[PDB]
Design an enzyme around this catalytic site. Structure first.
Site: not given
Lengths: 268, 268, 268, 268, 268
Positions: E77, E210
């Site tokens: 990231k 999620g």
């Protein structure tokens, strides 16, 4: 009608005190102290709600214990709109059901249809319109909603004054204006006109919620109530028998200051 | 009661047309055309208000002229709440008083107490609650308020549908819920329950205000009215006798399209 | 079903122009110019409303005159919700009833139940949900509401684009999502799913309101309409026969610019 | 259709009680007490959400344990819109899937397309429109959303009254008005009309959420439910077998107050 | 172009699972379990933000450790707009940079210009417009933003449905209307038109944020994703190898319920 029979039944409580009791011991003290009826209560609903719980009909067993322990009428609470709780209470064979806002509401929009029962109901009211609505639904007896378990009589005074004041307004009112008045009350016109003719409520009107002291009880009587309800506060004190007797004595001798001095002297 | 007598009186108008007339000539045309009653009117209240004036009870003299000119019942308007206008109309010996919102309101808060009169009253309504309030005050006959002198049926359709729809709602409704329903209508509970049992309004229900054409009149009848009122519009046209007959014929034969074609063909 | 028969009846108008006519002379010009149907109109509703009047069903007499004057189908307007106006029109024996928002609304809340009639109905719509609601009520043919008597095509373009766009959205849509889509449209799910399978509206879709020029008519056809309605504008000009022919020609040859040049050249 | 087979499957539960169970021991107590089915539940979703966690489908292993431990039908919860959770539950071979708002929502905008499954679904509703939407999506059985894990019946009473009341409104309603009514409910017209003809919901309607006592269960049945769901509350008490039996007995003998007294006497 | 090379590079991940790993041990488990790539993460950014810290690029050292430990591609990231973090990551020689909203934003107004790098970028999106903007900036791969570290798939479902739904809308859309559509999306018209022609996104579209269970992973695949990202949740449990394998198996066999039962059975 059976309705007028229920109304007459309720009138025999006129002049009396009704006491919340949570067991048979308390019930006997109440009876001996000269209470005209007792209200059976598993637990104080104040405490069940203070702990965030739902407050429902009391266990039939504990109600049965109190019904046996005394010869004075026994009352118990059903949740508003919970007509099955009421059926159970009727079948246990108690004397009066109190459709009580102190318990958790079961129906936001509808009260019990009290005409479908053979035993008389008590309901609460804040004003005349509400009283007349409860009566048309078949309540045989009205109490003030007052304020549950604060010891503060301010709400009960508001309600008594409200109801009595509207009755006084109604008694003198131009008959031609009573239609509009019934609209504004959202009350059945026929009960409004009957209340006008009687010059008082068609049913016994008691004070409830906040009555803490002999002085409170007597005030309610002086304001024109027919009797008072008292909470479990009485038994959470010293000599419960004495405090119980004091409130009964206050209601019996509500216009005798000397008596009120005597029963209030040394209560705590 | 005298009440049920007045209600019964009004039933003879079922199936009929009532026409506004401003003189005896018009009254006879109405009668010959087959109107079941006439409404006497000094002047069209629309015009009195359009010129910013107050519209009141009509002169008894001109009412007397119309009562003589015909054998059908005569109606006249009293201002809302103007019980003395009504006393005068009663004493003239007309058949029906219309407590009419088309005239200038006389009492903002109270209608006439119609029980204090021996002749039957018509009142307007927009919905069931209003209808039941007018009836309890002693109206023997209900009309829609509709819309005075526009020729637009939309308001009358709203009112009929509103009233009839609530009656249908009421017919099937859980009895235990009817108390709250009476509260929301601000209508007398006893009349609500009676309307439930009857499955219709306790009194004759007419359409009024905006009915302009045969088609309009028949629509009202198909929607479940007992009859219609028509304005002076009829007489502001070419062959008043023809237009008058056409609306009568429409109401008599309201479910026969063939007939409705015939009476509508070539009217303007 | 009789429903499919009515839908099929309406499909015979595909490719065609429908013209508002106020008399038999105009009706014949329309027919000779190649109109596929005519719309009978006592008076232009624009003018009746501009003068603050109510616009209703036309006199059956004048409708009869137009039905005689031509061999092409005749349509006429009933007010929205005015089912008796429709019964009359059916009985006169016209070919199509237009339940028209251009006339004064008769029922604010309900359209005619068009299934109770044997002749086909046209209804207006602004979007797909409205179209599907009118169809379920039994409309056999849909037009755009557009904009009555302005000559401005903008509203009709909005409506066509709206309806067609939602159909395109619906054609590709995940079947599992169509339930929510039907909720948002407030349209019957079963008609939504049928529209999805067809990939077009279950009924003929015409453009209406604002179509003023050949260019307008052709635009509507290029946007995917099945035909167009035109107002009385045509006859309020020079050589009405020429202007009439021009719009018919435009719709027939809507993808031929050369033709559109020819019919537009020198019109005004 | 397979739909009517699923509806029929669900009708076998009419008159019955369904109990939340978190293990096989509880499942057998439920079965022996006379429950008509059990709902398998890893953990009480109330507790998972109270601790801010996500509540999903239960582990298939623990569901398998309960399916084996009993011969009565087994139900389990899938998250709303989580059609893969449902596929897994179908493949495990349970009897009914509950598309449950008590679990964490998986799809904010869409429910499971329940037609794509061969086993029947339960869904919740607050009103008739929502019920009819869930049914069109293919739910074979409706329960009230009520209020998860409060013990408060008020929400369930609101929902039952809401649904039943609208059905009563619909039964009597002018057929011409049902179109608009379907729009306002945002419900499929075809299911609305079917509900009108039946005079009840096309599927079994159970009460759920808040049912805490025998009195509650019987109330739901007296209000016209076909059965009730009960939570794990039963097993958080003394003699869970007795409390379980009591609710079953209450639902079976819901119109016998004497029975209700017996099962309620001494419950705590 | 080098762009199409990067797009092609990303396509070889189609069908695969990408797992967050915080060390080499986890990376090997991921690889053996059949993950198509791993995402290197010093610490879970959820925890750094939960403690009110800033979450940045991970230490190059720990990234180097993971790159060595496995032969599958490694991702890491960079903060949004932090093009120097990206330069460092490129120079370390990882395979994919994720320009990640899970890390603390570095530039409120501008994303990295991803065309200035030779390795492919992943970006997040909530809808099509955002996706097309990230692609034009040079993202070779799109994921849903979903919801970081809640275990709740609701946001990811919203995003997938949003993106896919707009693509379906776009596929069928009148070409003339695509200009306005591009304006409303605030997306480059040329990429909108390309997406229309392709009928899908020009780049691989993964689900992220999620995804907690096999059922979740399979749902994402059934909704039309090309693969899934999974968090460190996998390794914070029992037999991480088993839970890892289960999600890979779920994505491989996403339309086989029987398989999904097997991999979900007994997971906790």
């Amino acid at each position: 009608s059976p309705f007028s029979v229920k109304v007459g039944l309720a009138q025999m409580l006129r002049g009396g005190v009704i006491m919340d009791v949570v067991n048979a011991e308390q019930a006997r003290i109440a009876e001996e102290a000269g209470a005209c009826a007792v209200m059976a209560l598993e637990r104080v609903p104040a405490d069940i709600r203070a702990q965030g719980g739902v407050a429902r009909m009391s266990d039939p067993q504990m109600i049965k214990e109190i019904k046996q322990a005394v010869t004075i009428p026994v009352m118990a609470k059903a949740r508003i709109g919970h007509f099955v709780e009421a059926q159970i209470l009727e079948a246990i064979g108690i004397d009066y059901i109190d459709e009580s806002e102190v318990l958790t509401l079961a129906d936001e929009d509808h009260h019990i249809n009290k005409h479908n029962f053979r035993i008389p109901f008590v309901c609460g009211c804040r004003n005349l319109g509400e009283a007349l609505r409860r009566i048309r639904e078949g309540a045989a007896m009205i109490r003030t909603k007052g304020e549950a378990g604060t010891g503060n009589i301010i709400e009960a005074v508001r309600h008594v004054r409200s109801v009595n004041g509207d009755i006084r307004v109604l008694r003198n009112m131009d008959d031609d204006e009573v239609f509009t008045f019934a609209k504004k009350l959202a009350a059945p016109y026929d009960l409004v006109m009957q209340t006008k003719q009687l010059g008082r409520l068609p049913v016994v009107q008691f004070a409830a919620g906040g009555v803490a002291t002999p002085a409170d009880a007597a005030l309610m009587m002086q304001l024109g109530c027919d009797g008072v309800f008292v909470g479990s506060g009485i038994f959470k004190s010293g000599d419960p028998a004495r405090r119980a007797r004091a409130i009964v004595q206050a209601v019996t001798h509500y216009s005798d200051p000397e008596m009120l001095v005597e029963v209030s002297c040394g209560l705590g």
